[PDB]
Design an enzyme around this catalytic site. Structure first.
Site, short mmCIF file in Angstrom:
data_model
loop_
_atom_site.label_atom_id
_atom_site.label_comp_id
_atom_site.label_asym_id
_atom_site.label_seq_id
_atom_site.Cartn_x
_atom_site.Cartn_y
_atom_site.Cartn_z
N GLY A 1 59.76 111.54 78.65
CA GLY A 1 59.72 110.70 77.46
C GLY A 1 59.42 109.24 77.72
O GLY A 1 60.11 108.35 77.20
N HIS B 1 66.55 108.51 69.64
CA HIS B 1 66.51 109.78 70.35
C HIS B 1 67.78 109.99 71.16
O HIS B 1 68.42 109.03 71.59
CB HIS B 1 65.29 109.84 71.29
CG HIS B 1 63.98 109.63 70.59
ND1 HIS B 1 63.45 108.38 70.37
CD2 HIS B 1 63.10 110.51 70.06
CE1 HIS B 1 62.29 108.49 69.74
NE2 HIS B 1 62.06 109.78 69.54
N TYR C 1 58.68 100.58 68.79
CA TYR C 1 57.23 100.73 68.75
C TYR C 1 56.54 99.79 67.76
O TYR C 1 55.32 99.67 67.83
CB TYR C 1 56.87 102.17 68.43
CG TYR C 1 57.46 103.15 69.44
CD1 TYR C 1 58.66 103.83 69.18
CD2 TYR C 1 56.83 103.38 70.65
CE1 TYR C 1 59.20 104.72 70.13
CE2 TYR C 1 57.35 104.26 71.59
CZ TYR C 1 58.54 104.93 71.32
OH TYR C 1 59.03 105.80 72.28
N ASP D 1 63.82 101.81 67.82
CA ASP D 1 63.02 102.77 67.08
C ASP D 1 63.79 103.40 65.94
O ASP D 1 63.26 104.30 65.29
CB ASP D 1 62.41 103.85 67.99
CG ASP D 1 63.43 104.52 68.92
OD1 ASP D 1 64.61 104.15 68.94
OD2 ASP D 1 63.01 105.43 69.67
N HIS E 1 65.78 108.76 79.21
CA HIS E 1 65.41 110.18 79.34
C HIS E 1 65.17 110.65 80.77
O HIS E 1 65.15 111.86 81.00
CB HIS E 1 64.14 110.49 78.53
CG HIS E 1 64.29 110.28 77.06
ND1 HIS E 1 65.25 110.92 76.31
CD2 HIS E 1 63.59 109.50 76.19
CE1 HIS E 1 65.15 110.54 75.05
NE2 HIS E 1 64.15 109.68 74.95
C1 LIG Z 1 50.56 109.08 68.01
N1 LIG Z 1 50.85 109.43 69.40
C2 LIG Z 1 49.85 109.16 70.45
C3 LIG Z 1 52.07 110.01 69.73
C4 LIG Z 1 53.09 110.09 68.76
C5 LIG Z 1 54.30 110.66 69.09
C6 LIG Z 1 54.52 111.15 70.37
C7 LIG Z 1 55.79 111.75 70.73
O1 LIG Z 1 56.81 111.64 70.03
N2 LIG Z 1 55.82 112.50 71.90
C8 LIG Z 1 57.06 113.15 72.32
C9 LIG Z 1 57.80 112.22 73.30
C10 LIG Z 1 58.63 111.21 72.53
C11 LIG Z 1 59.44 110.39 73.50
C12 LIG Z 1 60.25 109.36 72.75
C13 LIG Z 1 60.48 108.16 73.63
C14 LIG Z 1 61.60 107.39 73.02
O2 LIG Z 1 61.48 106.61 72.08
N3 LIG Z 1 62.84 107.63 73.60
O3 LIG Z 1 63.89 106.96 73.09
C15 LIG Z 1 53.52 111.08 71.35
C16 LIG Z 1 52.30 110.51 71.04
K LIG Z 2 70.72 107.71 70.78
ZN LIG Z 3 63.73 106.51 71.15
#
Ligand SMILES: CN(C)c1ccc(C(=O)NCCCCCCC(=O)NO)cc1
Ligand SMILES: [K+]
Ligand SMILES: [Zn+2]
Ligand SMILES: [K+]
Length: 358
Positions: free
Chosen positions: A131, A160, A286, A247, A123
């Site tokens: 991200g 994502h 995760y 994920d 990202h």
């Molecule tokens: C329970 N907790 C503390 C959270 C749960 C979800 C997010 C989230 O999705 N935030 C938006 C950013 C998501 C980025 C995804 C990173 C990823 O997996 N990229 O591939 C944040 C905090």
């Molecule tokens: K992807």
């Molecule tokens: Zn992801």
């Protein structure tokens, strides 16, 4: 010949400090299956300032260096999603250098497959963290491959959208990006509909496959194979960078897709039979033991080996309880992908790819 495995104790320790000890867990399970004995272990170099600046702006890098509540950190994407913590700059340079090292092994002919399971931070933009990605090592790896390879295919199987990598190359036809991802209003990062095809000279050299909640191995592979077949015929890539964020795997707290490592593994096998220079990256993930389970299984796929179902003893054996097997079971929840919407997406992409030459 033999796959390169980017690894050092120091690298894993750096990576170990969102995914605590995940890098140790991945490496120790791979060692527990003795897969490291069938690979060429290569110590990663730390990325130099100039290497990182092949993509990132000097302003962003100097700020990252400086904060590793600064008034400028919001501007540079540091904060809620990307906390400023001490040593984050050394961490980023380590990840970036590791993927660059893998790319250099590919250029030098040391291997056909080079693995950096701690990379894949898809990202980050030229001047902004995003991200949980501080540095875009995939872009850095692609820019290194560009020293030799005239056409590079980036495949992003993370849950994502690989927006940072796509945006980095959206105006060029030397790099084609392909991302399969959950696409749903409100779901991060919100980009990557099937109509997003890149810009200008790069128009039709970005491919996006929007997928809904609950997809399982068989339908995922059908989509992935049909897209990648059309992409390979239309683009004829000479090198591949493959991001394999886990994920998507059943049991991840994202609780969106319902994949197992066997289904991702079929996609990987399809790419590997192209017999191209291939840079393997991890990414998000995760559920830490499931992510180690996945990437260990995929390492076996790369090595053409079938792994024992029983989790071998090792430092983190207890994380694999209470059943201690390598296999992952899909959740019992619906697949929200309508077959005719999926086919509409595939038809749209096929039409887009008719515009792609050489
Ligand atoms: C329970 N907790 C503390 C959270 C749960 C979800 C997010 C989230 O999705 N935030 C938006 C950013 C998501 C980025 C995804 C990173 C990823 O997996 N990229 O591939 C944040 C905090
Ligand atoms: K992807
Ligand atoms: Zn992801
Ligand atoms: K492109």
């Amino acid at each position: 010949l033999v796959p390169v495995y980017i690894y050092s104790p120091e690298y894993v320790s750096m990576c170990d400090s969102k995914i605590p000890k995940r890098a140790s867990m991945v490496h120790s399970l791979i060692e527990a299956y003795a897969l490291h004995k069938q690979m060429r272990i290569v110590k990663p170099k730390v990325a130099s300032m100039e290497e990182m600046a092949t993509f990132h702006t000097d302003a962003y890098l100097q700020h990252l260096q400086k904060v590793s509540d600064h008034p400028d950190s919001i501007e540079y994407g540091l904060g809620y999603d990307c906390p400023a913590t001490e040593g984050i700059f050394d961490y980023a340079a380590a990840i970036g250098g590791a993927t660059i090292t893998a790319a250099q092994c590919l250029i030098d002919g040391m291997c056909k497959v080079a693995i950096n399971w701690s990379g894949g931070w898809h990202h980050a933009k030229k001047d902004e963290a995003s991200g949980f990605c501080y540095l875009n090592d995939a872009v850095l790896g692609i820019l290194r491959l560009r020293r030799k390879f005239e056409r590079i295919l980036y495949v992003d199987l993370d849950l994502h959208h690989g927006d940072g990598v796509e945006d980095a190359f959206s105006f060029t036809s030397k790099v084609m990006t392909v991302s399969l991802h959950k696409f749903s209003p409100g779901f991060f990062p919100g980009t990557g509909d099937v109509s997003d095809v890149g810009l200008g000279k790069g128009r039709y050299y970005s491919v996006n496959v929007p997928i809904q909640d609950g997809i399982q191995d068989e339908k995922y592979y059908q989509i992935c194979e049909s897209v990648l077949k059309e992409v390979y015929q239309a683009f004829n890539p000479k090198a591949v960078v493959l991001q394999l964020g886990a994920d998507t795997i059943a049991g991840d707290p994202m609780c969106s897709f319902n994949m197992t490592p066997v289904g991702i593994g079929k996609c990987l096998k399809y790419i590997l039979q192209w017999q191209l220079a291939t840079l393997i990256l991890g990414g998000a993930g995760y559920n830490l033991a499931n992510t180690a389970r996945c990437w260990t299984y995929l390492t076996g796929v790369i090595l053409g080996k079938t792994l024992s179902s029983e989790i071998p003893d090792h430092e983190f054996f207890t994380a694999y309880g209470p059943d201690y097997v390598l296999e992952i079971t899909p959740s019992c929840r619906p697949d929200r992908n309508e077959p005719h919407r999926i086919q509409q997406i595939l038809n749209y992409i096929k039409g887009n790819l008719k515009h792609v030459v050489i």
